[PDB]
Write an enzyme that holds these catalytic residues in place. Structure first.
Site, PDB file in Angstrom:
ATOM      1  N   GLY A 135      -5.974   6.661   9.153  1.00 27.79           N
ATOM      2  CA  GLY A 135      -5.824   5.226   9.138  1.00 27.79           C
ATOM      3  C   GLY A 135      -6.995   4.391   8.615  1.00 27.79           C
ATOM      4  O   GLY A 135      -6.928   3.169   8.708  1.00 27.79           O
ATOM      5  N   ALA A 136      -8.060   5.013   8.096  1.00 27.29           N
ATOM      6  CA  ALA A 136      -9.164   4.241   7.519  1.00 27.29           C
ATOM      7  C   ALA A 136      -8.655   3.281   6.440  1.00 27.29           C
ATOM      8  O   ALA A 136      -9.102   2.146   6.300  1.00 27.29           O
ATOM      9  CB  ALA A 136     -10.222   5.156   6.930  1.00 27.29           C
ATOM     10  N   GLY A 137      -7.659   3.717   5.689  1.00 26.30           N
ATOM     11  CA  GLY A 137      -7.110   2.915   4.607  1.00 26.30           C
ATOM     12  C   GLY A 137      -6.383   1.711   5.165  1.00 26.30           C
ATOM     13  O   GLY A 137      -6.366   0.664   4.531  1.00 26.30           O
ATOM     14  N   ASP A 138      -5.779   1.857   6.340  1.00 27.38           N
ATOM     15  CA  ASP A 138      -5.047   0.755   6.964  1.00 27.38           C
ATOM     16  C   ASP A 138      -6.018  -0.265   7.545  1.00 27.38           C
ATOM     17  O   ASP A 138      -5.764  -1.466   7.508  1.00 27.38           O
ATOM     18  CB  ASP A 138      -4.113   1.262   8.049  1.00 27.38           C
ATOM     19  CG  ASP A 138      -3.129   2.284   7.539  1.00 27.38           C
ATOM     20  OD1 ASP A 138      -2.714   2.172   6.348  1.00 27.38           O
ATOM     21  OD2 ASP A 138      -2.777   3.182   8.338  1.00 27.38           O
ATOM     22  N   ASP A 172       0.889  -1.158   0.000  1.00 25.03           N
ATOM     23  CA  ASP A 172       0.000   0.000   0.000  1.00 25.03           C
ATOM     24  C   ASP A 172       0.924   1.204   0.000  1.00 25.03           C
ATOM     25  O   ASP A 172       1.538   1.501   1.012  1.00 25.03           O
ATOM     26  CB  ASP A 172      -0.876  -0.009   1.258  1.00 25.03           C
ATOM     27  CG  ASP A 172      -1.730   1.222   1.419  1.00 25.03           C
ATOM     28  OD1 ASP A 172      -1.622   2.156   0.611  1.00 25.03           O
ATOM     29  OD2 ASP A 172      -2.493   1.241   2.401  1.00 25.03           O
TER      30      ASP A 172
HETATM   31  N1  ADP Z   1     -17.242   8.139   4.538  1.00 26.33           N
HETATM   32  C1  ADP Z   1     -16.992   6.736   4.446  1.00 26.33           C
HETATM   33  N2  ADP Z   1     -18.005   5.880   4.555  1.00 26.33           N
HETATM   34  C2  ADP Z   1     -17.839   4.547   4.480  1.00 26.33           C
HETATM   35  N3  ADP Z   1     -16.608   4.027   4.268  1.00 26.33           N
HETATM   36  C3  ADP Z   1     -15.560   4.853   4.145  1.00 26.33           C
HETATM   37  C4  ADP Z   1     -15.714   6.248   4.229  1.00 26.33           C
HETATM   38  N4  ADP Z   1     -14.504   6.788   4.079  1.00 26.33           N
HETATM   39  C5  ADP Z   1     -13.622   5.816   3.907  1.00 26.33           C
HETATM   40  N5  ADP Z   1     -14.238   4.620   3.940  1.00 26.33           N
HETATM   41  C6  ADP Z   1     -13.646   3.318   3.824  1.00 26.33           C
HETATM   42  O1  ADP Z   1     -12.270   3.442   4.054  1.00 26.33           O
HETATM   43  C7  ADP Z   1     -11.626   3.089   2.851  1.00 26.33           C
HETATM   44  C8  ADP Z   1     -10.417   3.968   2.632  1.00 26.33           C
HETATM   45  O2  ADP Z   1     -10.646   5.332   2.696  1.00 26.33           O
HETATM   46  P1  ADP Z   1      -9.543   6.337   3.278  1.00 26.33           P
HETATM   47  O3  ADP Z   1     -10.147   7.496   4.053  1.00 26.33           O
HETATM   48  O4  ADP Z   1      -8.792   6.929   2.107  1.00 26.33           O
HETATM   49  O5  ADP Z   1      -8.479   5.735   4.278  1.00 26.33           O
HETATM   50  P2  ADP Z   1      -7.395   6.628   5.029  1.00 26.33           P
HETATM   51  O6  ADP Z   1      -8.052   7.861   5.598  1.00 26.33           O
HETATM   52  O7  ADP Z   1      -6.824   5.823   6.167  1.00 26.33           O
HETATM   53  O8  ADP Z   1      -6.304   7.030   4.063  1.00 26.33           O
HETATM   54  C9  ADP Z   1     -12.658   3.118   1.780  1.00 26.33           C
HETATM   55  O9  ADP Z   1     -12.335   2.248   0.739  1.00 26.33           O
HETATM   56  C10 ADP Z   1     -13.855   2.667   2.515  1.00 26.33           C
HETATM   57  O10 ADP Z   1     -13.876   1.307   2.732  1.00 26.33           O
HETATM   58  O1  FRU Z   2      -2.264   5.506   7.448  1.00 27.40           O
HETATM   59  C1  FRU Z   2      -2.247   6.327   8.589  1.00 27.40           C
HETATM   60  C2  FRU Z   2      -0.897   6.310   9.264  1.00 27.40           C
HETATM   61  O2  FRU Z   2       0.101   6.707   8.339  1.00 27.40           O
HETATM   62  C3  FRU Z   2       0.999   7.573   8.959  1.00 27.40           C
HETATM   63  O3  FRU Z   2       0.878   8.860   8.433  1.00 27.40           O
HETATM   64  C4  FRU Z   2       2.403   7.097   8.611  1.00 27.40           C
HETATM   65  O4  FRU Z   2       2.569   5.746   8.910  1.00 27.40           O
HETATM   66  C5  FRU Z   2       0.627   7.602  10.427  1.00 27.40           C
HETATM   67  O5  FRU Z   2       0.899   8.881  10.917  1.00 27.40           O
HETATM   68  C6  FRU Z   2      -0.804   7.177  10.470  1.00 27.40           C
HETATM   69  O6  FRU Z   2      -1.142   6.451  11.602  1.00 27.40           O
HETATM   70  F1  BEF Z   3      -5.535   7.339   6.528  1.00 23.80           F
HETATM   71 BE1  BEF Z   3      -5.093   6.134   5.675  1.00 23.80          BE
HETATM   72  F2  BEF Z   3      -4.820   4.847   6.511  1.00 23.80           F
HETATM   73  F3  BEF Z   3      -3.738   6.375   5.042  1.00 23.80           F
HETATM   74 CA    CA Z   4      -3.588   5.431   3.071  1.00 23.68          CA
END
Ligand code: ADP
Ligand code: FRU
Ligand code: BEF
Ligand code: CA
Ligand code: ADP
Ligand code: FRU
Ligand code: BEF
Ligand code: CA
Ligand code: NA
Ligand code: NA
Lengths: 306, 306
Positions: free
Chosen positions: A246-249, A155
């Site tokens: 961290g939603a992506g994680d 990722d």
């Molecule tokens: N508003 C939302 N409602 C429902 N699911 C969400 C929403 N935002 C994010 N997600 C979920 O989280 C995943 C990744 O989104 P993301 O925000 O980019 O992660 P991160 O903030 O950690 O980078 C999406 O594919 C989906 O599953």
């Molecule tokens: O994906 C979210 C995470 O990525 C970071 O920016 C780097 O590892 C952290 O600060 C956070 O917890």
């Molecule tokens: F907020 Be994501 F996990 F990068």
């Molecule tokens: Ca991410």
């Protein structure tokens, strides 16, 4: 149940909570993934370096508490644990300021890599590739996991400011994309890394990589799942995020948990179900501040998915 | 009213306030001194480097708010603002963990030094001497202030972990002690720097420096004031500290404020009165968390000293 190895940066995320305070939140993308997997009752293990400082010990404690195997989490003798300040008015990369550059994880050595076995998973993010020696050590770890018959998840999780040579980011990240069995991009990351203006164009640009599974997250719209000769959008219920950190994680954690327990992770039904879990984890992760705080267990996830 | 120049590290002190939160407190010893002087209606000015990051901008904002001249506070293009984690179960040096090493202030250049004038003061702490180029730049600043007929104050304020070469600390700090008009030690620092087991022995060990004014702080017991052929303990009312962070800097601020407005700071009555102010500032500074929070104005100080 196959072991999933996570490597890279365990970090303390300082997250505003009141005008004069930060929450001290455990974070760091590969640590977040490790905990997500463990919370779902999976087998996750972390290898890497933090600093010999209170934040590093806090991250060790966190992984311990979360039942993540952290025997191979080492304390670097000199360098400090990554410390990240979060701005909740922004999302993702734009929301983070890295205060410790290079942090301890950037000094991962070849001898820090643990023994791998056939069928295990290794998940990596781009911060591990940002500077040496971690970059070369992590590429060696990837080569070793491939050699033994394990699987590699990547990722990019781009955080440009961590790179001392940001002009090396694109090529270095794409080298890792070429080694992976599974690659997860946000829509924005895919376009950035391929220099394109749409997901369609981005996917075409990486076609010759013959990546077995590509997932492009689409925020509330779920995820696009791309396997050979097939693209499909998989979406669940949209939520209003309280903290997207961290939603992506969390998403990756659900995905890899389900792939790790599958008889044959390449199976299309298995993949699509794993992405359904991933979407549910990503949604639920946003319900509380801190990357790890709301990472769901199975009871919570099943309740939400119903 | 003579201008007092402060140089060195402006830092964000992360101070526990609840089990899961840190207060985001402005700090950094020379910044603390600058603000202490300004709060007493004195003329203080800061020169140095912070990072181009939210913490650096927060420190610029803080100095601005506090009416400290910060025209010569620069943002380093590459390095991050010092970030320090405080443990309230410890005191002084033992209470701090420096997360950013080397922070931006360690990259002070010769061209960062502002124009000095006769009768001005320059106050320095040892972190400014910890690594190059700041070490050599700060020694040059000291030489320039001496050359123009200004005065030099030095508070070792030891923080060993900031030194990449800790074996250089003793000699480098003592070189600065030899350049100063005023030196303030804690009892512990004096003994450490001289390798002695008592204040008496420590003072004898620095006698050949012919330092015009040495002050040794004694916590609740006040301060020992040593001038040629005279030693005297000056004490005020003891308080129960809520946060000792920066009490020593508040002390220096009161001291230097009073020396800076004196017709003849060498006068014994002026010095002893300045130390009375210093003790009152040090006591009052401890009444709230954060080095700067409870730095007193004159109305508060006069009320306390009565
Ligand atoms: N508003 C939302 N409602 C429902 N699911 C969400 C929403 N935002 C994010 N997600 C979920 O989280 C995943 C990744 O989104 P993301 O925000 O980019 O992660 P991160 O903030 O950690 O980078 C999406 O594919 C989906 O599953
Ligand atoms: O994906 C979210 C995470 O990525 C970071 O920016 C780097 O590892 C952290 O600060 C956070 O917890
Ligand atoms: F907020 Be994501 F996990 F990068
Ligand atoms: Ca991410
Ligand atoms: N308990 C106290 N009661 C009254 N004054 C104090 C007390 N502790 C410290 N001080 C004042 O602060 C000065 C410096 O003490 P110190 O705690 O070492 O500063 P710092 O914590 O910033 O290093 C003393 O000389 C005295 O004036
Ligand atoms: O003197 C107290 C101050 O000294 C420091 O440790 C270094 O400058 C700061 O963290 C604190 O505010
Ligand atoms: F070093 Be003291 F706490 F100002
Ligand atoms: Ca001190
Ligand atoms: Na969260
Ligand atoms: Na205070």
């Amino acid at each position: 149940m196959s072991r999933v190895w996570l490597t890279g940066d365990a970090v303390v995320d300082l997250i505003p909570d009141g005008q004069q305070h930060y929450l001290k939140c455990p974070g760091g993308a590969p640590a977040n993934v490790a905990v997500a997997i463990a919370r779902l009752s999976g087998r996750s293990a972390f290898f890497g370096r933090v600093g010999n400082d209170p934040f590093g010990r806090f991250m060790q404690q966190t992984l311990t508490d979360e039942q993540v195997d952290c025997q191979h989490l080492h304390f670097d003798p000199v360098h400090r644990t990554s410390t990240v300040v979060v701005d909740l008015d922004e999302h993702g990369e734009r929301s983070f300021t890295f205060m410790v550059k290079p942090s301890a994880d950037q000094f991962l050595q070849l001898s820090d890599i643990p023994s791998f076995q056939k069928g295990e998973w290794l998940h990596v993010c781009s911060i591990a590739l940002a500077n040496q020696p971690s970059r070369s050590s992590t590429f060696a770890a990837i080569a070793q996991m491939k050699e033994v018959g394990g699987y590699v998840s990547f990722d990019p999780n781009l955080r440009e400011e961590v790179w001392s040579e940001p002009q090396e980011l694109q090529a270095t990240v794409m080298r890792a994309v070429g080694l992976a069995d599974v690659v997860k991009f946000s829509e924005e990351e895919l376009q950035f890394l391929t220099g394109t203006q749409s997901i369609e164009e981005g996917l075409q640009a990486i076609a010759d990589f013959q990546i077995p599974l590509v997932v492009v997250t689409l925020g509330a719209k779920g995820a696009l799942v791309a396997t050979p000769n097939s693209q499909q959008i998989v979406s669940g219920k949209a939520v209003k995020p309280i903290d997207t950190t961290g939603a992506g994680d969390a998403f990756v954690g659900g995905l890899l948990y389900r792939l790790s327990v599958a008889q044959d992770w390449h199976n299309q039904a298995t993949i699509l179900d794993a992405v359904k879990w991933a979407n549910g984890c990503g949604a639920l992760a946003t319900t509380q501040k801190g990357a790890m705080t709301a990472l769901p267990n199975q009871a919570a996830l099943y309740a939400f998915l119903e």
